[PDB]
Amino acid sequence: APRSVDWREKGYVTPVKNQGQCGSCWAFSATGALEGQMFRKTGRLISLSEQNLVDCSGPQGNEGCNGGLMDYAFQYVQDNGGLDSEESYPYEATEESCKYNPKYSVANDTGFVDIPKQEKALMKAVATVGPISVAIDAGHESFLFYKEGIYFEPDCSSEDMDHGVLVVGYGFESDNNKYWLVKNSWGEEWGMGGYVKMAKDRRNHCGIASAASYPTV
Amino acid sequence: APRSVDWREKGYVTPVKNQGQCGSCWAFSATGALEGQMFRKTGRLISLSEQNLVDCSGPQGNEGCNGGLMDYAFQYVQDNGGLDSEESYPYEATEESCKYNPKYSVANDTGFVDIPKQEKALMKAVATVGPISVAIDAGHESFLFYKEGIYFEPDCSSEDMDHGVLVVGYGFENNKYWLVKNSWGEEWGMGGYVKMAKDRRNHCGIASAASYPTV
């Protein structure tokens, strides 16, 4: 793998979204990774309907605005045979009723892939694949109020993760200088324009390599 | 016909766009009446690609960024299948190479209907269908540096028109007006909109080249 990656600078990443008062992180994480893969494939960046996942992917094991898994989102897309654009199926930020229309579907998959739970396996993947759906331990007062620099929270857990995010690359900066560039779904006024630099290669910090995946496209 | 009409009140109209330093007025006009008809059919408002129509409707007789006519644009969407979204084929404000992809198509038409050269006939169309493609004489100063009110250019042409726009409704304020959507950004007129004088000897030829696409 490369030494320094940023998939934003390749037009692989849509602008930062906001999930608001609803627990749909998983669906922003899924549409992020599906957006980048549809992009490598088709050359067009089209924003995908997080609401389509929030509404319809209940049977494949999701909990609407109370939690979900990214791979379950990928599984819904494959079974459903598609996913509408953000434009046709806008984010209403509550679980509503399934209004999927196949005439607007702008994405597909043939499944997903689970990266081994090593930070180097997640490095190589972020490098050859594109942006990657990951889960983190986000429960700390200090994440909720993030600003800049490399995030490192001593009390962070490596096996119990609660939040789904998207890894868009990584790089360095004198001390412990490596990081994951993580796209969050809490809008632009949070973090470094919606992004958090996570500590990379400090014992799997916040469990970023523990539940990492991407859709096959 | 209803005392007053507005299609923005009913979500048939996408926001006022801007053609820039390119002569693509026919295209923005064409996409507007086609956006309003799709909403009629489906229930989803989706923004369409002027740049698709600027590049690829050449075979129908349109002249890229140096002009065109709305009915060749409608003909192009039938003589092609559908048309791509704004997001998949963005607007570059210049004539460039044709880049259409059928995988990203979100509109269709079964043809187009032309309205008889009469203002009364146009009132009925707006009221019974939705946004209507029209063509007007815009060469005049009171249009360029125009802020507010019912427009009236005493020396406006009824035969010779050079600018395609969209009619999104009409109303009363014994006065009448045309609720016309322009493509000169939100910065011009009434948020990109203009009140043309209505039922006043076919002012600026609003009713002269009026069409709308069927679905």
Ligand SMILES: *C(=N)C1(NC(=O)[C@@H]2Cc3ccc(c(Cl)c3)OC/C=C/CCc3ccccc3C(=O)N2)CC1
């Ligand atoms: C997002 N705002 C919220 N969190 C979720 O929806 C989580 C994200 C999450 C946590 C952990 C893992 C992933 Cl891939 C995603 O990794 C393994 C998962 C363990 C249990 C996660 C899980 C399983 C089923 C249903 C929900 C859920 C979960 O907590 N998902 C809502 C706050």
Ligand SMILES: *C(=N)C1(NC(=O)[C@@H]2Cc3ccc(c(Cl)c3)OC/C=C/CCc3ccccc3C(=O)N2)CC1
């Ligand atoms: C928009 N910025 C410009 N105007 C045009 O491109 C026009 C719009 C137009 C004018 C007239 C009519 C329609 Cl439907 C649309 O109706 C009468 C027909 C006129 C024919 C003029 C014409 C012919 C060929 C190519 C373009 C064109 C024209 O001026 N169209 C560019 C300034």
